[PDB]
Amino acid sequence: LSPEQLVLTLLEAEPPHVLISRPSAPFTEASMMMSLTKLADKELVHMISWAKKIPGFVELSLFDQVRLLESSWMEVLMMGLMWRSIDHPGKLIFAPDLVLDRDEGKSVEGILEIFDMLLATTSRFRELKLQHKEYLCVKAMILLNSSDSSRKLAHLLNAVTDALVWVIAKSGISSQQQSMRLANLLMLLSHVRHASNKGMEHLLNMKSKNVVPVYDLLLEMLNAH
């Protein structure tokens, strides 16, 4: 209902932290791809559950719930990573025990590029001092914006947008500063989205090479590209 209530709903809806142990051995092509896909697969499960807890999500057409999730999953994974990684500069906090330096990227052809965008975007979020309630609204907006169910989606996207606007106004900065902050946060959407595309191409390529494992859900969501 109210923006505060939408934010409080999103707060409660946050998925729990997924636990993956680092390989005992220093990272290989195989062990790094195995760790990041295992994590992705477990996180996809919790994502779907998180989506269902967004007010009005389950009121959409089944075929829109599928298209939004197929469209945004990698972007939503990546926004969660950047938020986990924001109180820990230089590091990518994939999981409590799966913390990676730009370094360990070395262990897989091309994944160093991906880790850089992820660290660069995270940096801009850290420079903007992105808040918890902002992150909640922005993650929701990434799912709802990944494009009668179409009338209901529009209205749901404007409710989360209204919530972010409310959060930012709770800060007490001038009106002109609220607009600027809202603009700076949102212009990062295209940056996240870029990191998602490169990340998806990369995963599609690693799957071609025989490196990828057999994970029903992740394979399913990658084949919708």
Partner: peptide, 10 residues
């Protein structure tokens, strides 16, 4: 299948 089942059967 698995996405639709998690969306509806869970």
């Amino acid at each position: 299948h698995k996405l639709v089942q998690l969306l509806t059967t869970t």
